[PDB]
Amino acid sequence: ERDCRVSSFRVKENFDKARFSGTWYAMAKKDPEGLFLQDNIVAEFSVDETGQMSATAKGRVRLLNNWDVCADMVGTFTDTEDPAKFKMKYWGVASFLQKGNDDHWIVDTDYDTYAVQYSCRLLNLDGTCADSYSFVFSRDPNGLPPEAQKIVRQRQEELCLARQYRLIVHNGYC
Ligand SMILES: CCCCCCCCCCCC(=O)O
Ligand SMILES: [Cl-]
Numbered sequence: 001e002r003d004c005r006v007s008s009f010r011v012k013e014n015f016d017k018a019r020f021s022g023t024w025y026a027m028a029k030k031d032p033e034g035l036f037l038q039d040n041i042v043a044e045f046s047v048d049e050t051g052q053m054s055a056t057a058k059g060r061v062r063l064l065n066n067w068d069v070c071a072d073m074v075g076t077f078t079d080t081e082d083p084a085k086f087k088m089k090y091w092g093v094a095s096f097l098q099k100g101n102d103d104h105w106i107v108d109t110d111y112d113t114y115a116v117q118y119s120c121r122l123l124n125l126d127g128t129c130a131d132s133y134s135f136v137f138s139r140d141p142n143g144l145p146p147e148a149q150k151i152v153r154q155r156q157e158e159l160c161l162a163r164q165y166r167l168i169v170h171n172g173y174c
């Protein structure tokens, strides 16, 4: 019944980069193929005078053969015609960390409590996403209040992802 075409997904009306700046703690993640950020994931958003949004992120990543390292990542956001949809160029402060360019959508936020982010890296031929990821962010590292949690669950369902998240732990690893 429900529409899972990426082209159908609503995103945050009149998204305000300035209001979104500051520290966001990842509470939950839906992983893409070949997942990178594992847990202890914290993002820092900024906007400069030209209106350009950028971010840094810290988190544990586990490169294969199970060697744990705290990745330090950088992202810069190129605007699109939709104020809530961006292209995010990202890299690690270390050369060998994963680099790339992903769609970065702010699906919903109230700026001071919760955010829902979404990226489809690759479409299916029917317009659904073949390879997606999504972060749920909280301003408070101890988690969302119930009213926000309930809104977020609705958005997770609208993205056709609600069954597919895992919780992100924060235990000072970094
Ligand atoms: C919120 C901006 C984060 C900086 C870009 C790093 C994001 C790349 C990792 C996301 C995909 C994954 O973690 O599997
Ligand atoms: Cl609930």
Ligand SMILES: [Cl-]
Residues within 6 Å of the ligand: 162, 163, 164
């Ligand atoms: Cl579920």
